[PDB]
Structure formats: structure tokens, C-alpha cells
Design brief:
This is part of a larger assembly, with one copy of chain A (164 residues) and four copies of chain B. Chain A is of the alpha+beta class. In chain A, a hairpin with a 2-residue loop joins strand 10 and strand 11. The longest helix of chain A is centred in the N-terminal third of the chain and has 11 residues. Chain A starts with a strand and ends with a strand. In chain B, helix 3 links the parallel strand 6 and strand 7. Chain B is α/β, with parallel strands linked by helices and 370 residues long. Chain B is built from 14 helices and 14 strands. In chain B, helix 4 packs across helix 12 and helix 5 crosses helix 6. Chain B is 34% helix and 16% strand. Chain B has four domains: 127 residues, ATPase, nucleotide binding domain (Nucleotidyltransferase, domain 5, 2-Layer Sandwich); 41 residues, Actin, Chain A, domain 2 (Roll); 110 residues, ATPase, nucleotide binding domain (Nucleotidyltransferase, domain 5, 2-Layer Sandwich), CATH 3.30.420; 89 residues, ATPase, substrate binding domain, subdomain 4 (Actin, Chain A, domain 4, Alpha-Beta Complex), CATH 3.90.640. Classes of the chains: A alpha+beta (164), B alpha/beta (370). Chains in contact: A-B, A-C, A-D, B-C, B-D, B-E, C-D, C-E, D-E. The interface between A and B is medium-sized, with 37 and 32 residues. The complex binds adenosine-5'-diphosphate (ADP) (3 copies) and magnesium ion (3 copies). The site of one magnesium ion has 2 residues of chain C, from loops. The site of one magnesium ion has 5 residues of chain B, from loops. Chain A: It is a peripheral membrane protein. Chain A: One of its GO terms (molecular function) is protein phosphatase binding. Chain A: Pfam families: Cofilin_ADF (PF00241).
Chain lengths: 164, 370, 190, 166, 370
């Protein structure tokens, strides 16, 4: 295991999971999808301010929240993710968050072992999360059908405001 | 300003604000403790999993329902589910908006007392109210007259309601609901070579019953068609990859709603309890109750249950009387629809039990008020 | 990663344990006594048919290096035998420490086949392609979808050229068609 | 400061420090009595080779601790009293093997701290000699540095701390 | 005149005539194909070996059980075993005496249909009948009231039976039986240095479990005694000549009957399934079912299983109720005893399904009759 989580990531998770009554001007800077990284010393899980996605921009500059999110993951390193999905089922309309464990084969072993052995140190601190998505290849995470297969299986008819 | 309506059902928790059409939060009401030691270190392993995260990780969990047939068996996981649907699902605090809870009639007073105590002590809500699921499901119908056939996952109950005055002496309660149907389907599916023993698997049988089961117009002729040919059999895609071929089980396990002798219960089916309650009602309101049988709940979503309910009731009721079975297309959440349309009413805004009213009264104000 | 069954096969033991998202399944832990030492013994036993006797322990290390740098697993046994039977297009020579050269033919892919057909050295155990499927079929029915697409291999015995492709083919032959099979073959799995 | 990771496998013993890519010490795990010699000197030399480890369980203990002393002194030229050691094992392992491992490491060598991980879990860490790669990438982790079983923790607990900790 | 009763169990085949106390034919139900080429020419090498000849020549064979947990997996070897026990063991023809077959409840209908088809087409019996193993094991007890704990080699099932009317809605079935115990013993014996991988060897572990395993009064204190000293260890004489020293495995592998989490099953132990089935039964028959827990099968032959079953049930049942565990000394063949005492009854002689009744009905008469 080893690596633990910092206070900023826990604060961001508590901010994203539990939303409250907010003003229409502030509601547009909420966090939609944020990744997690390691510092220089590889001892804390820190979010990078560079790569991120806001809730405000979704549907505007970012035509597709998921489509613009696949290319945001670096293919030469291991990364965490937290995607807020809005999928439509035959039964009803749900809005859940997804934990994506990005781990390509092109990354070095030093970045794969650290992120694989410390996954229980981050997932345990993220209380209430259900949808877990482990993705290693890039083609499997690039496809749109896999998210509906993991979320609800064949029941999900539409994903992110558009049908499958 | 807005009010929260939380239909804490036996199988699903429909939670949402007031004044809107559909509930935004819908998820199964189960908690799952980790079954295996968990060799991998880190990654955010938690002590429990509630709702959709439990449904996704149900392979390594041991799912269990905190609510039996309507009574809340375990309280720690119940308040955990409440905290979850309040914070991790709606992202709102209970201290601001009043909450509305639902329950089935003929309910132990201890359940309602513990509900009120948990809502007023742990969350400290400004006000709340404990209504009845069937009365709210009747509100959603827009009318005030007619008996309600409310059958969810743990309890099936019927209460006849006239033009505003309900009849509490004719409230029937049947412990036969969707969970019992799922258990019967699991028991009768072993005769085909498919063993479902564990709780996690049982959810697969639940989905199979949800999307492959129907109620027959009559039992005998459908069995005769089941006996002859496979014209009735249909295959299902299991999550593991295998396929199953169910035959008469498509309409045998839903027949338990009308013939409780399958799971062993001695209670009259859902088609006879309604007639017995109406026959226990007043003789002038029977003409209006016969033509108004409002159905609600997820168990009333089988294809053909409305036609069989009709046929059975006109078989029991006199011939001159006309029987109507209101089968709304949103009867799966009719209780939540009624709660949401009820919370927006101006006249109801005065009868919320408040903390200032609750202090001197203790947890016993709910019986005298509601 | 944290999810996936592990195919660990070293020099003395081959064992498989399926591990989910942190909780492993101890009731599905399979153990097979077939490993690289047994493969070396089988190669020594089948190399005497070519005129090269390796009896002593010291020599056996030469056979071990020969198996390490000249043996591969075939995509299928039958067609590769048909190619072995016809022509020497398959044979390859080796430089022995004493100076002599040897010409091995079907032994390049016959002794690694013992991993999938234990009836060569006499064991009754199902090959490494069937023990994994039997352990996954002994596992839970919801974790099979995640265990089928994650078969992590390790150990020096899993370093034969083409063992990943044969493992794949065998598992999708055993597993249902709708399920997708993936065989993670890391380049540092030794 | 640095930590030792010792993959005491059935056929090879991959032993090396933490924080480096490749294990410096690799040799077969056999002892040979004249018809002792450990590792490459046994491979070069009239002996009767035998493996102390069967399918994962350690059959004989004197030669096992002899191999440990060898790989510690005649191969790495370091003392166990300074750097913590990391041992590996296969799952579904008899508890007696791990108990004897802990007892030998804490009584004969008197290590400041140690830990008994699983070979497959470490080989998965290496994915981001795979077991040794994962052990070495695991030993450098800061979060893991707290869960080493120490001698001061071992005294009152006896050789049974390993089951409850690891 | 006489009737044949054939208890085609998962591990043993008890076959004998009617009206006698003990079954004359007892042998393991396995078939063995020759594993090796067989260089020697002649001497009567056969394609298969059934029963004791397979047990004697198990070294060069590959033993396998045609019956899983109650369902018959392979049919050719099953009818081969039937032909064997009919001709080479009893030296009688099936065309003369009627045969009586047994099965476990909650059984796939295909198994019973194939049983009837094989008995009526290949052997052409004048009449037959398919009873239930637990009901017959209760007959052997001489009484009519009490729940039956039938646990053989492949399936453990419990059915409560009142004063002639059994309760089919409370029939519990557990796939944990002696074969699973043998597998667990093989898995936990490798920790001592004894590897049993092959089927032939597994029989040695089966005999070791049969004559060296017992169930503890409680798990914790017996482990404490196992941990301290070898006062518990005992040696065994292997057929090859070696000796083994087993310790806590003498009472750890039989504990799986009460804690299924060892082999991974999620099912409640045999001490909880009985209590849950009785709690699912009627409230007036519980007083009579609590004091009558008839045990049968070879798995219930461990020393001390009766005392632990008692203690567990009075731990689960209320204190005022008295618990009795009928532990007969011939409960290994109680199913056969009940079948033989049943076949001599005059009232039962009328309900045999006959060939003349079978012709027009096809293989579906068995479900409507039995
Ligand atoms: N489409 C469907 N067809 C048949 N049964 C269904 C369907 N959808 C849900 N159900 C059943 O209805 C139950 C849900 O009941 P619900 O109405 O949520 O009760 P409550 O309102 O008390 O929560 C589930 O257990 C399921 O078995
Ligand atoms: N390049 C290779 N190709 C095929 N087999 C190999 C190769 N390298 C090593 N092996 C085999 O792998 C074995 C080493 O197994 P190893 O992974 O060291 O087991 P352990 O991890 O238990 O020590 C050797 O006996 C050798 O036969
Ligand atoms: N003396 C004994 N002690 C413990 N277990 C026994 C004993 N004798 C037999 N068994 C177990 O009982 C099993 C036989 O079950 P059995 O009663 O023949 O089932 P069935 O009636 O379905 O054939 C064997 O597999 C064996 O493991
Ligand atoms: Mg309801
Ligand atoms: Mg190894
Ligand atoms: Mg039996």
C-alpha cells in the first residue's frame, strides 16, 4: 500500500458527491471530472489543476463530456479518475459517479505498482461510491458502450444525454 | 422553502424534492459488508456500500434489506441509507428543507417512533410528517374516491377511501409482495437446473422477474398452453454469459399474488382481499369503490395484471355493478408522485410536526398528529 | 490493478488465485504441481530419442537453458505436429558447451505442451488452460465477467513465445462466446 | 534506511535492495552435501542437490536458514540488523511456514522490522522477476512504511502477529 | 411378488428386496475407464468397472461419480450401474419384480423423467414408483411427525412432516454434503504435506474422513485444545505403508456442515436451515417439530454430531421448548429401511405407475402421480 490521500482530494470528493443549494453564477464552476496524481516524492494523492473538467462548460465548449475525457488521460502513465455520469435507463433516469482506474501497459512498473497497491487507500476514503471501472487498454476505455455495460449493463439505453 | 419527500420503501428508496414530476434519486435499499479479507491494499475499500455502488460490487458483498415487509429490522443501516440519500445522492442538508416520510398502514408504532426520533435527533429537521403510502398513491391519481391496491416489495395493503373520509376499519394488510414472489421464483427455478442460493444472485432472479414475468388471464388455459409446446418459453441473457430457458415459471410465480398457497400463506389473494374489504365497507360506498380500484407499486407492473384483477373482481362482485381497474403508466412511483403533489399543497403546510412542537411531546406526537 | 485471476507458474508449482476489487477468493485457489522442473524432466526424457542422454544433475542445467532459449508453445498442437512431420523447416541447432551441436525437432513445442496436457509426464491434473476456467467457474457468478478479461500471468514458465496466444484461444474456447478474454502478458513477468 | 526484499522462491532466490530496477542476487535455491554448497557454487560443483522448498512450503529449515544467511552475508555482504527485510509467499499457505519464517527472521538475525507479502499481489504492483519488481516498488512507498511488524511489536505478540497483521 | 427398492444415492447404491431388514447390495456408485494402454494381452480387460471391482482396481482407473448433488450428470454409466446392480449383483431380472427408486426433493423434472424412461424402456418393469429419500427415512423411524435432516453424499435437504401431511413450502435444500466435506479435507490436508489431487487418491481421503473425523461440541474450545498439545492428534495407516498425523483437521472439515463459509458457500449451516424451515412452518406444529429432528444419511454418522445439533437448536429455539435429536444407529441406510418397510405396505400397492398406465401418459405420469 503505502501512499495515502491528502486533504484536498477528500475535500474535492466531499464537494462533488454532496451538492447543496447554490447560486446560478457559482453553480457553473463545480467540478465535473477530476483526475488524481502523485507528487515529486510519491507520497500523497494530489489532483492536478491542469487537467480537469467543469460542470459549467459541459454542453458548451465541451460537446461531449466523455469524448473529451478519454484524450485527457495520458497514455504513458497511470492515472485515477472520477466521472459524474448522467445516463438514461429504460427504467428511469439516474445520475451517479464513476471511479475509473486508468492503467495502461505502456506506463513503467514504478507507476503501475504504486497505483495498484494503493488503490484500497483511496477507494476506502471515497465513501458511498458504487460504480467501479477498471480500464487497462486504451481501446476499451475509448469505447462508449463499456460505460453503459459497467453502469447498468444492457439496461442503459442512453448515456450522457444521447442514445447509444 | 422546498420540501423533501422520501419514500423509504422495502425495495427502492424514491427520494426527491417537492413540486417536480419524477424522483431524481432511485436505488435499491440494501447495505453490503465486504465478504472476503481483501488482500489488495488501498484503493478506497469501505466498510459498507449503499445503493448502486452495492449493486455494481454485489459480487464480493453480502446484500441484505434493512426493511422486512414494511417494518425496519435494523436501524444503523437504515439511518446510514438516509444519510447516504441525503448527502451522497442529493447533496443537500436535512436542516434546511422539511422531509416527508411514508409508511404502510397497520404498522407497529415503534417503527414510526424510531423514524421520528432519528429524523429529529440525528438530522435535526425543522419539520416532518409521516403519511401513508396508499393515501399518497391515491393523491397521485387526482381523485379522492376509490380503494387503493398498494403492493410494493414487502407488504401489500388495501385501504378504501371515500370523498375525503377514509375507512380505517376496512384496512387490509397482506404480507405477500415482490420479495415473496422472488423467493418463490428462486424456489421453482431449481427444478430447471439453476440454483440461486446466495443473496447476490437473488438480484439476478429479481431482474428476471421484473423483465420476464407476467400474470395470465387465467391459470388453467395458460398451463395447458405451457404443457403443450415451447411457444411460450423465452431465453434470458445472464451476466455470466449463460442462457436459461424458463417455461411456466413466467406466469406461475406471479400467480402467488392471487393464490398464496404456493409459498404457504393462508391469506386470500390480492383479488379477494379487496372484495372482502369492500364488503366490509359501507353499503352505499360500494358502488363507487367497485368502479375505482387504484393500483400502485412496482409489483402491479406485470403485463396483464390489470385484466386479471378486473375479471376476478367482476367474478366476485355482482353482475349489475361495473368494475374498473385504473392502471396508470407511472404507478411504479405513484406514492412518490402523491407525496410530491401533497407537499406543494398550501393547506397541508400547517400540519407538519415541528421541533418546537416535538420537544415537550417527545416521540409520541406522531401518533396523535398523523 | 486489483481485479483479475493470477496465473503464477514458476519452477516448482503452478497456482491460480482469483482476486476481486481487494477481496480475494481463498475457496477457489487451485494448485498444480506442474512447473518448469517437470518440463525440464520431460524434455530430458524425450531428448534421449534423438541420441542425447542427460542423466546427471549437472547436465540437466544444459537442458534447462535449452528449454529456456529454444522452446515455444504452439497455437495448436495438431497443425504444428503436421509441420514437424513434414520438413526440417522447423528444426534448429544449438551450441553445446562441449562443442557439439544438436538438432531438435518437435521437442521445441512438445515439452511445453505438458503445461496444457499433463498426461505426458503422467499427471492427471487438467492443464493450465483448464484449471483457470474451473476456478473461475467455482467463483461467484458476478465476478466472472471481470475475471475472464483479466488473466494476469507471471513466472519464468510463462515466458515461452506464443503461450499468451494459446492461453487466450483456449480460454475463449472454454468461456462463453459473448464474454471477451484478455491475457495480460507483461514483458517483466519473469 | 533502505529495505531488503527477498523473494524466497521455490527455484530461485531473488534478493536485492529497495528502489532499484533489477535484483542483484539471483541463484538456484539448493544445498548440496558431498556425495555444504549453496547457489552458484553448488551449480558449478559430486553433490546431491535438493530443494528445501516444495510447492511453496519450506520442507527443511536448517538449509533454508543457511540459504538466508548465505544470501545475506556471502552474496550481499550486508547485516540483517540494519535494513528491514521483506519476504514473499504464495496464498493458501500453511500458517506454520509463515510462523517459522517470522521466528527465524526475528530470533536468528534480529531484524528491526519485516513483512510477509503475497507474491501475486507484488507481481501486480509491478504492472503499475515481476514479484521482486513489485516488492521493490512497494518497499519505497511511504504509506507502507508504517505497517512493518517490528521487534518491539513482536515481543508481546509472539510469532502469531503475522496472521493478524499481514 | 416381492418388490425391489433401489436407493440410487450419490455415493452408494443400496439395493435389495422388500420385507428384509438390511440391504444386501452396497457399493460405491462410480465407473472407471482404463487410464493406461494395457500392454498385457488378455486376462479379461474390460471397458468399465463398477462398484467393488472399481474400488479394488482404482489404481489404474479414473473414478468419477455419475450423480452430482442429486442430479444424474451422465446417463450411459447410470443405466450401466443399474444393469450391474440388477444382473451382476442381485442376479435377478427387472421384468418380474417392481422396482422402487428414490430421489431428493427440489429435483429437476428431467432427472425423474429420464429415470422413468430408462426403467420402462430398457428394463421394461411391470411397475415402479419414485419416492422421496427423506420421507422414506422418516418411515424407517416408525413415526409420522417430525422434520427430517437427510444429508447424503451430494445433497442435504430438510422437509418437515406432520401427522401425515408434509409441508412442501418449507422444503429446504443445501448443496453441502459429504463430497464437499471430502473436497475441503483434501484442500486442508495439503497444509500438512500430503497432496491428494487425483480421483483415485481422493477415496483414501474419503475413508479417512469416514473413520477419523468427528464433530466438536463447540469449535472454539476444541481449537484451543488443538492448539495446545498433540493430545488430539491421531495417526492413520495408509495403503502405501506411510503414516500421517492429522490434528485440527479431524474436527475442522466436519465443521463445514455448520459453517459453509469454509468451502465458500453462503448457505446457512445444517443447524440454521432446520430452524429457518421450522420458523417457516405453521405455528402450532413447531412444538412437535422441535422435539422431533430425525437424522439420516451417512454424513450424520460423525461422533458428536447429534450433541452439537441439539445444542445449536436449543440455542436457536426458545428456552421453554425442548429439543430432541433422534440419532438411530442404522441411520446410514434409513432411506433403504423406509423404502423396504414402505414396499410391504398393502395400501401403497395400488399407486405404482404401471406400463399400461405409462403408455398413453408418456414420461410425464410421474409428476402427476408421485
Ligand atoms: N417491470 C416490472 N415488472 C414486474 N415487477 C417489477 C417491475 N419493476 C419492479 N418490480 C417489482 O417491484 C418491486 C419494487 O417495489 P416498490 O414499488 O419499489 O415498493 P416500495 O414502493 O415499497 O419501495 C421490486 O422488488 C420488483 O420485484
Ligand atoms: N526465456 C524463458 N523461456 C522459457 N522458460 C524460461 C525462460 N526463462 C526461465 N524459464 C523457466 O522458468 C523457471 C524459473 O521460474 P521462476 O519464475 O524463477 O520461479 P520462482 O519465481 O518460483 O523462482 C526456470 O526453471 C526456467 O525453466
Ligand atoms: N462412519 C462414517 N462417518 C462419517 N461419515 C461417513 C461414515 N460413513 C459414511 N460417511 C459419509 O457418508 C457418505 C455416504 O452417504 P449416503 O448416506 O450413502 O448418501 P446416499 O444415501 O445419498 O447414497 C460418504 O460419502 C461418506 O463420506
Ligand atoms: Mg411501497
Ligand atoms: Mg515463483
Ligand atoms: Mg441419500
Amino acid at each position: 500500500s503505502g501512499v495515502a490521500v491528502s486533504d484536498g482530494v477528500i475535500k474535492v470528493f466531499n464537494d462533488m458527491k454532496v451538492r447543496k443549494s447554490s447560486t446560478p453564477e457559482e453553480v457553473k464552476k463545480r467540478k465535473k471530472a477530476v483526475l488524481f496524481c502523485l507528487s515529486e516524492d510519491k507520497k500523497n494523492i494530489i489532483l492536478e489543476e491542469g487537467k480537469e473538467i467543469l460542470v459549467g462548460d459541459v454542453g458548451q465548449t465541451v460537446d461531449d463530456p466523455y469524448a473529451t475525457f478519454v484524450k485527457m488521460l495520458p497514455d504513458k502513465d497511470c492515472r485515477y479518475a472520477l466521472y459524474d455520469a448522467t445516463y438514461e435507463t429504460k427504467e428511469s433516469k439516474k445520475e451517479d459517479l464513476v471511479f475509473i482506474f486508468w492503467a495502461p501497459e505502456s506506463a513503467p512498473l514504478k507507476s503501475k505498482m504504486i497505483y495498484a497497491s494503493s488503490k484500497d487507500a483511496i477507494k476506502k476514503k471515497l465513501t458511498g461510491i458504487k460504480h467501479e471501472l477498471q480500464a487497462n487498454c486504451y481501446e476499451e476505455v475509448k469505447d462508449r458502450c463499456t460505460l453503459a455495460e459497467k453502469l447498468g449493463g444492457s439496461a442503459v439505453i442512453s448515456l450522457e444525454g444521447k442514445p447509444l | 422553502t422546498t420540501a423533501l419527500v422520501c419514500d423509504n420503501g422495502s425495495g427502492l428508496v424514491k427520494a426527491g424534492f417537492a413540486g417536480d414530476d419524477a424522483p431524481r434519486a432511485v436505488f435499491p435499499s440494501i447495505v453490503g459488508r465486504p465478504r472476503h479479507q481483501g488482500v489488495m491494499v488501498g484503493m478506497g475499500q469501505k466498510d459498507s456500500y449503499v445503493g448502486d455502488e452495492a449493486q455494481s460490487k454485489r459480487g464480493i458483498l453480502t446484500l441484505k434489506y434493512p426493511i422486512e415487509h414494511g417494518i425496519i429490522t435494523n436501524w444503523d443501516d437504515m439511518e446510514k441509507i438516509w444519510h447516504h440519500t441525503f448527502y451522497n445522492e442529493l447533496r443537500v442538508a436535512p436542516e434546511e428543507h422539511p422531509t416527508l416520510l411514508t409508511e404502510a398502514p397497520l404498522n407497529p408504532k415503534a417503527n414510526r417512533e424510531k423514524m421520528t426520533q432519528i429524523m429529529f435527533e440525528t438530522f435535526n429537521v425543522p419539520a416532518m410528517y409521516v403519511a401513508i403510502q396508499a393515501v399518497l398513491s391515491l393523491y397521485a391519481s387526482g381523485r379522492t374516491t376509490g380503494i387503493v391496491l398498494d403492493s410494493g416489495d414487502g407488504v401489500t395493503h388495501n385501504v378504501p377511501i371515500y370523498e375525503g373520509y377514509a375507512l380505517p376499519h376496512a384496512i387490509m394488510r397482506l404480507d405477500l409482495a415482490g420479495r415473496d414472489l422472488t423467493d418463490y421464483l428462486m424456489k421453482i427455478l431449481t427444478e430447471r437446473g439453476y440454483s440461486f442460493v446466495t443473496t447476490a444472485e437473488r438480484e439476478i432472479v429479481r431482474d428476471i422477474k421484473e423483465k420476464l414475468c407476467y400474470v395470465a388471464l387465467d391459470f388453467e388455459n395458460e398451463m395447458a398452453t405451457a404443457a403443450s409446446s415451447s411457444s411460450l418459453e423465452k431465453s434470458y441473457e445472464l451476466p455470466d454469459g449463460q442462457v436459461i430457458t424458463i417455461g411456466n415459471e413466467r406466469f406461475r410465480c406471479p400467480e402467488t399474488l392471487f393464490q398464496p398457497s404456493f409459498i404457504g400463506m393462508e391469506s386470500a389473494g390480492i383479488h379477494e382481499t379487496t372484495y372482502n374489504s369492500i364488503m366490509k365497507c359501507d353499503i352505499d360506498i360500494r358502488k363507487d369503490l367497485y368502479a375505482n380500484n387504484v393500483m400502485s407499486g412496482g409489483t402491479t407492473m406485470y403485463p396483464g395484471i390489470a385484466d386479471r384483477m378486473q375479471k376476478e373482481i367482476t367474478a366476485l362482485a355482482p353482475s349489475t355493478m361495473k368494475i374498473k381497474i385504473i392502471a396508470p403508466p407511472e404507478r411504479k412511483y405513484s406514492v412518490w408522485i402523491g407525496g410530491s403533489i401533497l407537499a406543494s399543497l398550501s393547506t397541508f403546510q400547517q400540519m407538519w410536526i415541528t421541533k418546537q412542537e416535538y420537544d415537550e411531546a417527545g416521540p409520541s406526537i406522531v401518533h396523535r398528529k398523523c
